[PDB]
Write a protein that binds this DNA or RNA. Sequence first.
RNA 1: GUCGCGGCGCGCCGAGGGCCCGACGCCUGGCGGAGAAUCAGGGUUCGACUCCGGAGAGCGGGCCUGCGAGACGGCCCGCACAUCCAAGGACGGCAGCAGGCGCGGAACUUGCCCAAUGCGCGGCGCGCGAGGCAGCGACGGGGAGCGCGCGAGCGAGGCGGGCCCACAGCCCCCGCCGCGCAGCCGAGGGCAAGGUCUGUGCCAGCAGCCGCGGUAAUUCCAGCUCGGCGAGCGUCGCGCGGCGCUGCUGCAGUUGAAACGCCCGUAGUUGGCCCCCCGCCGCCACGAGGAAACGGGAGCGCUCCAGGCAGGCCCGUUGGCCC
Lengths: 139, 119, 129, 62, 176
Amino acid sequence: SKTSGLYTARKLRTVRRVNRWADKKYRKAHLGTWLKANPLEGACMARGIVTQKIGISAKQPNSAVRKAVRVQLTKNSKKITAFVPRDGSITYIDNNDEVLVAGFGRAGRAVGDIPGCRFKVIKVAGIGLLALFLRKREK
Amino acid sequence: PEITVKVRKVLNNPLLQRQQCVVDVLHPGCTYESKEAIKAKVAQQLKVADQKNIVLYGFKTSFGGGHTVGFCNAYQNMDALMKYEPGFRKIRCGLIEAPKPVSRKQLKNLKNRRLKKRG
Amino acid sequence: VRINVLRDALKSICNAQRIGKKQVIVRPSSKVIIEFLQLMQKNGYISDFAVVDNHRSNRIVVNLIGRLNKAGVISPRFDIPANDIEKWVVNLLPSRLFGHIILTTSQGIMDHIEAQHRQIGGKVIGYFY
Amino acid sequence: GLTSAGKVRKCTPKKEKKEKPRPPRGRAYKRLLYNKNFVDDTLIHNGRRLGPNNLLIRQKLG
Amino acid sequence: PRISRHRNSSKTYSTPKKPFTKPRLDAELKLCGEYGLKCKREIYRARYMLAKIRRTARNLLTLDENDIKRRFEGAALLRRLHMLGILDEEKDQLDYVLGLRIEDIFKRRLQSVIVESKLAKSVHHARNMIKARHISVGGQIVNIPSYMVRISNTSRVAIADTSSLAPNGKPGRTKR
RNA sequence: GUCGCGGCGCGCCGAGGGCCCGACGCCUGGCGGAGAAUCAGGGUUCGACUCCGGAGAGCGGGCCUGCGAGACGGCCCGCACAUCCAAGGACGGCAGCAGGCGCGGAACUUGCCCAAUGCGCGGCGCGCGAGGCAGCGACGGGGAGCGCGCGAGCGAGGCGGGCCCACAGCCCCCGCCGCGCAGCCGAGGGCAAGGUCUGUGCCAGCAGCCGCGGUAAUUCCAGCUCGGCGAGCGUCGCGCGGCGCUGCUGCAGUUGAAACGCCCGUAGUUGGCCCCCCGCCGCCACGAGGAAACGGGAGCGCUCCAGGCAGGCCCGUUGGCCC
């Protein structure tokens, strides 16, 4: 119904503060559980040493082997799974060679057929992945 | 091509014994070859007739335009000029010999070293 | 309980116009109802209105000419600054040229145009377009 | 799987790039885009307007 | 610290809400064809200058007449639009400022003025001539094709005296 | 006791004080404001930084001098951590400026100089890593190019002079030679642009989303052609808009998410009509008075422009006025 009294500003201010939390987006912006949980911890991107190169299956109905690396982030010692983008790019990434990882673009959700990979490699050993693919700089 | 010189906002300054003037150098299709070249015309307007006692400065060409806006410090006498003139602008006049300052860091290193040994 | 005397009156007039009834009765008569209706009578939106005396709150028999389109109240009556009047007219009324916003002013109950000419603002009683 | 990676990339036969002339740049390129699209009415016209990359527009211009 | 910090700066262009609308892509290309524009940012600047001027006109029209701001600020908007030539001299009212297009911003620009004076064979010709400083407005050579002349300077727009009248006599290719 | 008032402190007496108009406790990847981002309106989010006020110079304390400091480019001490040592001792404190190290996704030269603008002392003038200048610097903002055209023209340079400058330099002017030069993402839809030709054959990959790939791939890998924007374009993170998906304007609750099983009831919020003429309230208007910058905004052609407060023989030329 709503309250419309010249002196009921306090109630409306309290109702807005209480019901603001129902949206997942306000909670994922102000509750702070996300900031602690995120391995990027609110950073635009993170750096970390490769530990394992893993072949991850695509979700149905797609049938494919997506190529990814498990990365332990130097910043918080937290192992994530990051897809290495483009074709034959995994060959450039060796083991333990350091990779810079950014998120996929769904703000912390897994995107595409790939499940649980919220991150993708952008720079291998200080060399941009896209450059090594376009053969602009060698490995 | 010709250079025509007009001075504007001339102000008498007996405080510093100088005439503060705005020199306008109009050279359409040509260039004034240095402030010294056009000093005589500004000296004529002032009637000082002494080119030396005039200090030309802040000469700014306008984009494309022949007009160049500049300023003059026409001191009554050379002695007054020496008393009230930035030393660098007297060297830039070529009127005074160049005194040589040492590196500021070298000057302050020696100051610190003096303080270190019995102030 | 009956918190707003004017809201029930302008609702009972709009319902009557939609039916196409020429005359209607308002159960409680207030001085502010008479002033709102008087403004509509000086704007041609209503016709003659007669307040019968029952020795209590009083009734109003209102004559209509089909001319009125919508009559309402803004509750709570919010005091409107002089420069805020136009922002209210851009949402509450259709067209800057037609319509009326009735605001109680220190000078008296007046339309938005009258308030704009006197360059003063006040609490909004309601609106009739 | 991981061992068979980039198989289409290696398989693709290397294809040579045509040595096209340098295109007009800036205002001149905008002039040519405007000329082709609105003025002339020949490059994109089969008697009616057509899309820039249309197969009919190709072959006609090569 | 550093007076540079205290120097101001602003963006003079306003990109469209939707970038790939076919009607609004083609019209911008036509407005680059008739005005010799290098990039869409120049058309966006034209709409940013018009929108601000229109917003002043709309905020004054809503204001009551004889409210002092409408009389003073409105006269200063009209005078500016008349001095540039964006507003036709005859109209002399605030309402006509609202009913204006970016064509009026473009027409006052120097590149379009040179073609009107018949000095330039085309708008593409004029742009190159102004870059080559062959054009002088009121005795000052200009190198900017978006200079935008005022109604008084329209007559004073002329070929730079030192450029195509051959005072140099050995210009560019002729020299060697 | 203090510069002074005060539970500020103590002695004594009394039992108060604060609270659902949220006391108290906890937590804060919490300096505040002038402001900024985005935006019809209403709003939302951020407030390290320029100006203003506070706070702190590894962390706690304590002090002296002075008119003013609980001062750290003063001292004393405890802890943590350095430093040199002839082993007895001494000796620090870059959240000044460069510069390094570590850390992180991320951030400039151990440059020069007091010439401007201030300030400290001193009539004839120095001191200043305040501040200024240069370097670096696609944080970003602004202005021009990559031709015009049909025979002529530039500017990018270079080289000179001038100008400018603490000194150079840049800009700009002037002669001389003269040497235009594009990316980054896309083309199934959303969303602008091939139903082109290979390779591949649910593989490889792509694809924010829906989807393509299993042999006629408009979606991959190349060529070709084409679109968008442009000296910038793509990617990620986040804020705002989108989103009347937070709803004051302005959301919904029969069935989609959702009326408390019912009733009483305090706090809270809300209460008909009535007196013209009076006091208090809120209310609206208009004033005073209170920093600018910013944001507008008068006027002024930095060649335009982002800027700036300039200018020109001029209101006592300005720099109004607003927030």
